[PDB]
Design a protein around this nucleic acid. Structure first.
Lengths: 286, 127, 27, 180, 86
RNA sequence: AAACUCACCAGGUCCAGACACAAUAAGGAUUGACAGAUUGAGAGCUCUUUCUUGAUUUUGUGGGUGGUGGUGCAUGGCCGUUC
């Protein structure tokens, strides 16, 4: 499940240690005993096994007593507590918790910044947790790769939220007070936003990545402005992204024509007005 | 005011009679047996109107249950009533009819769903 | 329990046998 | 001798009834001191006061201005004129109390800790630390005749001290030139 | 005054432990208040690790503290003061 | 799931001095088959105001006999557990 309350008993004795050993467990997986002092330049016996027995219960490290290849490992909190400690180190998180939000490899953890406006610490833990050979290798790098693939239309004039930091599993997404298409009740400009669903994948073919995945939780009419309700689009549609070279676009292009025809008609019995558009234009006008 | 029918008929009734016209989940209470726990309450009531500045305000005499039923007869006296600890002062009138004295309770520092400030006292500041 | 443990979780008052739900596969 | 009291300081020979602030004369790494009120009967003390300064590190003699003995002095104590420094700075400690009323597992019901409700409720921003050093923060409290609900290393007992922090800073006291 | 060296000698040498063990305990009788006495100053973490300073702006500063020759260091002006005479 | 369950709560008291000797100890120390006041948020209990009392026991006290404080430290078989 989850533990959070095994962290605040430490001192400076682990702060010099961490990203020396985090770049030291990557240079040299499971670390034996007399190295926590000597990766960080910490001294041999000035508050040392006191501090390592302090770290021992806290589950960010564990005493893996194997046969002369001992283990001090920076359990699952070696990423988790220590990325909270990393955001304490990389000047974003100042304490833990105003947090509500649940996924699988994306938990929404509602925080307030160094500025004071809120953002969200989303955490990546796939397999629940199952953190092993690639599962740690994924949530380290899928926090880094999806730090690189949430700006594919923000530069190009369209709406993708911006990532801030990629500390070990943590991806910080302002915070978005959304209203998905299952929460909403009525709309004021209906026939514009059906033909703009042909036209968003028009926009997605400019950047070279066609996105599909549209359920009833997707398109947030959000809160940029609270009072006058200048809303916006948050488009949670990303992970059905396919390189167009692969031979599955025979049924991706035809999705752009005759698959969105239900939601503005049925949800929003009101049979629709507008025209549409293909993506045969976007093959050349990239 | 008790039913709309004549007030010199209704006020001094016991745990007997009209409820034999009323349904059996509140007939298996009030038309079975009077439960005379408010009978020596009258004997302390008949002194709780004497030495007051009369017709106005008697003393808050305490009462600490949640299934006890008051009968309307006693216009002009005050009793303090269980709300979990303390004794809510009630100038006893015919303005409560067969409902609990221990219904005077919503016992919490209020449920923080609009201002969640005491939830902020359980979270983690962290070294 | 039967006196060879300090068993405090999954306690039994049922049927006098003092063998836990977690002890059908131990006891 | 209580150490918030005018003692006639000599650091060398000349006399001034100075009003010092003795603090512990341990090996201090950070050079941060205390407003220790009173004295310790064996170890080194570090006075803190304003004196009108004779800057040559003498063996200091602190005494009482009376011809009490056959010496015409009452010799209270000898030591060292350590320094004259502005950034040699103080921090008086506190140790509050926690008397655990039972023998629990995780949440320890402590009484004899907080009487008044606005002294219960508003004083819930104080770091919980055991006399054993188990630091932590108050997550709740309800006690009246004062509880809490936190998470420590192990268990607690009725002879423990669930302390809290008031680390306060009093301010020093000047001299008096005595010559007679 | 020798009688209070037996009356108050019970306390004015045995209150020396009021410094040591309970230095600024807010002491608790049902008459004693918690807010008023120990009110008007910070509460950092650890004396061997925290940060206290020199010159605040308060009336608590005495006369020849806020009208000082603010001694820089002694050790870094004993070379000056002695070497003014060397 | 009802108060109990049910591990918690809003307020009270039945009750702590034995063992020695020290003040009073049988003019009432402190005892009881009872009659009242009895109520603290609803009780049994007490004996100042019938009278059993039966030598015995009342208290500011400390060794601690009182381990009906055992968490135990393992020691001795014996079987969940580990094989």
């Amino acid at each position: 499940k989850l533990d959070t309350s095994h962290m605040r008993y430490l001192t400076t004795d682990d702060f010099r240690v961490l990203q020396a050993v985090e770049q030291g467990s990557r240079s040299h997986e499971v670390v034996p005993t007399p190295l926590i002092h000597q990766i960080s330049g910490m001294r041999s016996q000035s508050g040392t096994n006191r501090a390592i027995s302090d770290l021992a219960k806290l589950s960010l490290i564990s005493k893996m007593r194997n046969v002369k290849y001992d283990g001090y490992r920076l359990t699952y909190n070696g990423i988790d507590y220590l990325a909270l400690k990393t955001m304490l180190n990389r000047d974003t998180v100042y304490s833990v918790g105003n947090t509500i939000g649940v996924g699988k490899e994306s938990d929404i953890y509602k925080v307030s910044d160094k500025n004071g406006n809120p953002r969200v610490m989303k955490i990546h833990r796939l397999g629940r947790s199952n953190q092993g050979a690639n599962w740690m290798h994924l949530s380290r790098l899928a926090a880094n790769k999806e730090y690189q693939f949430m700006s594919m239309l923000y530069s190009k004039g369209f709406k993708v939220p911006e990532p801030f930091d990629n500390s070990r599993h943590i991806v910080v997404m302002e915070l978005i007070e959304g209203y998905p298409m299952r929460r909403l009740r009525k709309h004021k400009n209906i026939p514009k936003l059906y033909s703009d669903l042909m036209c968003f994948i028009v926009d997605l073919a400019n950047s070279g990545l066609i996105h599909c995945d549209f359920n009833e939780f997707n398109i947030m009419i959000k809160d940029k402005l609270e009072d006058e309700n200048d809303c916006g689009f948050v488009v949670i549609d990303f992970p059905q992204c396919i390189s167009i070279q692969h031979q599955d676009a025979d049924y991706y292009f035809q999705r752009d024509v005759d698959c969105i025809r239900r939601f503005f008609k049925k949800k929003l019995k009101y049979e629709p007005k507008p025209d549409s558009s293909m993506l045969d234009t976007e093959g050349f006008g990239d | 005011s008790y039913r709309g029918v004549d007030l010199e008929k209704l006020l001094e009734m016991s745990t007997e009679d009209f409820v034999k016209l009323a349904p059996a989940r509140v007939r298996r209470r009030f038309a079975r047996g009077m439960t005379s726990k408010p009978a020596g309450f009258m004997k302390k009531l008949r002194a709780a109107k004497l030495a007051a500045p009369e017709n106005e305000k008697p003393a808050p005499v305490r009462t600490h249950m949640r299934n006890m039923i008051i009968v309307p007869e006693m216009i002009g006296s005050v009793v303090g009533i269980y709300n979990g600890k303390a004794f809510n002062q009630v100038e006893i009138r015919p303005e409560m009819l067969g409902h609990y004295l221990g219904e005077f309770s919503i016992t919490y520092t209020p449920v923080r769903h609009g201002r969640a400030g005491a939830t902020t006292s359980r979270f983690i500041p962290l070294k | 329990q039967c006196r060879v443990c300090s068993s405090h979780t999954g306690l039994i008052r049922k049927y006098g046998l003092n063998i836990c739900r977690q002890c059908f596969r131990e006891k | 001798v209580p150490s918030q009291e005018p003692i006639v300081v000599q650091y060398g020979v000349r006399r001034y009834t100075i009003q010092p602030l003795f603090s512990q004369g341990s090996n201090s790494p950070n050079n941060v001191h205390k407003y220790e009120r009173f004295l310790h009967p064996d170890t080194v003390s570090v006075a803190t006061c304003i004196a009108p300064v004779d800057f040559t590190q003498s063996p200091a003699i602190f005494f009482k201005p009376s011809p009490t003995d056959a010496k015409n002095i009452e010799l209270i104590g000898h030591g060292t004129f350590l320094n004259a420094d502005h950034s040699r700075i103080l921090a008086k400690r506190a140790i509050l109390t926690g008397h655990p009323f039972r023998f629990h597992k995780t949440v320890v019901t402590v009484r004899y800790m907080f009487f008044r409700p606005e002294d219960v409720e508003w004083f819930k921003s104080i770091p919980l630390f055991t006399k054993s050093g188990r630091s932590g923060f108050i997550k709740e409290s309800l006690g009246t005749h004062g509880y809490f609900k936190a998470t420590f290393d192990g268990k607690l007992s009725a002879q423990d001290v669930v302390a809290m922090s008031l680390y306060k800073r009093m301010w020093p006291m000047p001299s008096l030139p005595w010559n007679g | 005054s020798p009688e209070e060296e037996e009356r108050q000698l019970r306390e004015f040498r045995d209150m020396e432990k009021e410094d040591r063990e309970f230095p600024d305990e807010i002491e608790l009788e049902p008459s004693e208040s918690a807010i008023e006495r120990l009110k008007r100053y910070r509460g950092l973490k650890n004396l061997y690790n925290c940060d206290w300073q020199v010159d605040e702006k308060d009336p608590s500063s005495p006369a020849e503290w806020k009208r000082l020759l603010r001694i820089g260091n002694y050790k870094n002006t004993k070379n000056r003061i002695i070497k003014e005479t060397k």
